[PDB]
Amino acid sequence: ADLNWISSALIKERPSADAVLAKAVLAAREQLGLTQLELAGIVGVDRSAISRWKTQGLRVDSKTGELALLLVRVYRALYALFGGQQEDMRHFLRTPNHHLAGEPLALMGQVQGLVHVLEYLDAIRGKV
Amino acid sequence: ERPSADAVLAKAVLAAREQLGLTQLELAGIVGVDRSAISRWKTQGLRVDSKTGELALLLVRVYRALYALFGGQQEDMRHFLRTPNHHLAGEPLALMGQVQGLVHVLEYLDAIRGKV
Amino acid sequence: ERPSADAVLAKAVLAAREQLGLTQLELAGIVGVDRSAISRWKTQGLRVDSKTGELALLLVRVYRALYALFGGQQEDMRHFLRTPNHHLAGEPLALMGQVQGLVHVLEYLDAIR
Amino acid sequence: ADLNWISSALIKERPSADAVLAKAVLAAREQLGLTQLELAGIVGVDRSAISRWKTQGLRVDSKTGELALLLVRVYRALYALFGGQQEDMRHFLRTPNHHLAGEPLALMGQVQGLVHVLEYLDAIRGKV
Amino acid sequence: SEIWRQCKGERHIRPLQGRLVRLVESQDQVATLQLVDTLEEQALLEELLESSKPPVPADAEPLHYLLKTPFRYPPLRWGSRFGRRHEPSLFYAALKLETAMAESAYYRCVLWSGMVVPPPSGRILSEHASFEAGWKVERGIRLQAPPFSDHEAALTDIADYRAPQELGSAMRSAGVQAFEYRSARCPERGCNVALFTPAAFTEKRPRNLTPWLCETTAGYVAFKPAHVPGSPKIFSWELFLVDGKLPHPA
Amino acid sequence: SEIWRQCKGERHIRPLQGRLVRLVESQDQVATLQLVDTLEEQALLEELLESSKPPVPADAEPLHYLLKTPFRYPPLRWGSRFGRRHEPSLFYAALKLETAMAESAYYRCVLWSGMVVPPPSGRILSEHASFEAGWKVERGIRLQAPPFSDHEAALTDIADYRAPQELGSAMRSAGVQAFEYRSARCPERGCNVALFTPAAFTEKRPRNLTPWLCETTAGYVAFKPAHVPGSPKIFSWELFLVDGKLPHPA
């Protein structure tokens, strides 16, 4: 309709996928209480490329961005399972786990371990 | 010259590329690389400690799980890789395009031999 | 003694206690006191800036809106208090036992006029 | 069956109404950033009785309890209207309001002002 | 009401039926869970707060908790569109979901513009729920169509309720049980519905309870489902702004 | 499967019908809203995360988002009761809500007991949603009644999945589309339901979507509705503990 448009044609700003991913993982890195080297060990960058994520945006199409999508999914599952309680989400990553056979953040340092941590959280979800 | 980890991993993944009918592009979608470094991998090697190294090793493990399940028949290994499965929601190589699918395909093949 | 603010309000509430037929128990539930403090009002006064005094000023404001609504006839001023309304979800006096109800009954009566 | 009955019997708590109310208003006072005398002016007692709430509770059916429940209801409406953002819930109380003709926390110091603030918040709810 | 007298009031009273939809708050029980230590203590605390609320009308008691809640709370001190402070509250809803979101988005800004200085966060992330319900009345009016639509602009005025509030009192005394009307805030000219009595509901189960995520800033009000993927539905302030002020009966 | 061969399961395949109920997480979109600045950016971010998830089975894509989600995620590394990690995952649910809460409460303790050191808060306040849906299959098995009931205890083993996982593979190869079975965690001995195929669903939308507040401690798991007044339903750890350890296939 006339003015149905004049602020829907108003509030239609389009964000970039690379800039949203670069913003999401840096917010997930800090909420999960991870150091940047800890972040670099999971997605496969060094500290300099993380500084570049805010001038160019983490390429979603790349393999580095795919590991970041898994890491954001790990936060996403941890937030829902632990009711958004930050001290419990960080404790889960830093505490040795009986089911995952190790500390989840140490496992996330490798590709297969990150998948195993994510698949464990994705399986607890769906059951509750 | 002398043996090193990067040259051993490079020689291992390219012997899986061939034997499986994998284009330079198809391999690129599995280990996260441009054809860029594919050519450099036989003069410089593939860095083992990198994430491309973790995916390259995961692909070699897929190739070895295929060699043990089909007895080395290349016509049997490439047929499975490109024919759509039902236990897997799609064809195996398309699944290996994503990180979660690449791990899922390897663990699926280890499950079939896991009882043999 | 000499005029104060405490002796006038306590005094006005008890003048609203009857004319409305309010018992010592019912009045205690509107201003939030024990029946002991009710009779102490007549020679000690009711502190106006109290929280009880705020509830007491709302109660005498209720008895007026009544007084101006029904001219002054107690036969109908007490009848409205204890007969269940439907504009109000209950009878007005039982509502006045609550804090939100007493304010609601006062704003209802001031709207009738 | 008796398995869930005996498990719930060994697990169940019967909380005190006066102790629950005393705990809830002190928790609401700290989350809303109210001083002990700001709370004292809303419920109609002094700071000496506030310290008695932790050991003897807060009588629900007393007039002090009715005012305390209205304060908890005010926090209840603010948390829902502001999505649990505490700095925004305190802001509404400390900021002059056009629709309420004054600062809500100052208005809540009197009986009619506390009801007027609660009725406004309860009316915004139900509209959205 | 001079429109009820002009506009053929009682002889247009019809039997009417349809479905409704409205937005509600869904973080009430979560709020009280922060003040207390167990779920058992929280359920007891919610019952203590229930005793201080305004009483629920007698004929609304057997209803579902979400269907009888709007009948016990009074409106704003300047009253709703077709009801005042001293009158029994009406059950307001919309015919379509887009209309209810526009009505709810307007009242998100009413809370926002009420404060002299804006909220310091500049962004309030709230969670809400939507439900649908069926209604039918024996005595119903549609303010959108016949003679009332020639007074439609006065009914849909942005900043005073006087003419609709007097019409609401005349309809109530005339025995009207529910009535449709055109929304003053919906940009797509949607129609709302209001119920005087709880007997209008045909079910007493709220249907299609849907969670929603809301984002309120100084420029827009947005909604998107909290349980499924989806694009946000934006409602900017300029859908309601007059000049640079948010309109409301002062 | 020795149970499928001994009980001659192909002789007992018959049409089945009924309703289901299950609990799911409801704070997924809430989580991604914290990493992000607008609702528009959040909807795009959820889309990026969708591309990395396991692929949706072809027959499950036209379903509702809540009905097709359990078909794309693999189970735990030790597999579900009637399915392993290398097989297509099953849609697990319960016949009654109290059975689904007991199954959900057990897996709240599974996450809790997985950590060597318990969660430091000692109290996790989570929010969940339950929905009901109808299902009907031409080929169904009831594991609880006829000859399978003589293997009921082996199927309801609290820490061993091998025998039910062998039975799940044999039923899948035999063309079974859905099956009922006795729950191993519900103290009321209710019976669950599992679906191999998405074609079992008879409706378009998950019905009676109900929000729930959950409280998980080291001693119990409690549930209470988030939208209406209610008393909590407690599920102590003693409903699942063996000796002082939580049982599960290692």
Author numbering:
A (entry chain A), D (entry chain D): -5 to 122
B (entry chain B): 7 to 122
C (entry chain E): 7 to 119
E (entry chain F), F (entry chain C): 2 to 251
How do the authors describe this structure?
Here, we show that the NatR–NatT TA system, which is part of the core genome of the human pathogen Pseudomonas aeruginosa, generates drug-tolerant persisters by specifically depleting nicotinamide dinucleotides. We show that NatT is an NAD phosphorylase, which leads to the depletion of both NAD and NADP in a subpopulation of cells. NatT function is tightly controlled by NatR, which is both an anti-toxin and an auxiliary factor required for toxin stability. NatT belongs to a subgroup of RES domain proteins that have adopted a Flap region mediating its interaction with the anti-toxin NatR.
Ectopic expression of natTE29D, a mutant isolated in a screen for increased tolerance in P. aeruginosa, showed stronger interference with growth and strongly increased survival during exposure to tobramycin or ciprofloxacin. Thus, the E29D mutation boosts toxin-associated phenotypes, suggesting that it unleashes NatT activity. To explore the NatT activation mechanism, we next solved the structure of NatTE29D in complex with NatR. Structural differences between wild-type and mutant proteins were limited to subtle changes in the NatR’-NatT interface close to residue E29. A water molecule bridging the phosphate positioned in the NatR’-NatT interface with residues T70 and R73 of NatT wild-type was missing in the E29D mutant. Moreover, the E29D substitution changes its interaction with R119 of NatR’, forcing the neighboring E26 to adopt a different rotameric configuration, which in turn disrupts the interaction with the main chain of the C-terminal helix α7 of NatR’. Based on this, we speculate that the E29D mutation weakens the interaction between the NatT Flap and NatR’, thereby promoting the disassembly of the stable hexameric structure. Thus, the activating mutation E29D may not only disturb the interaction between the Flap and helix α7, but may also disrupt NatT dimerization. Importantly, the NatR–NatTE29D complex showed a single peak at 60 kDa, indicating that the TA complex is in a dynamic equilibrium between an inert hexameric state and a smaller, active subcomplex and that this transition mediates NatT toxin activation. In agreement with this, purified NatR–NatT wild-type complex (4R:2T) readily bound to the natR–natT promoter region, while a purified NatTE29D complex failed to bind the same DNA fragment.
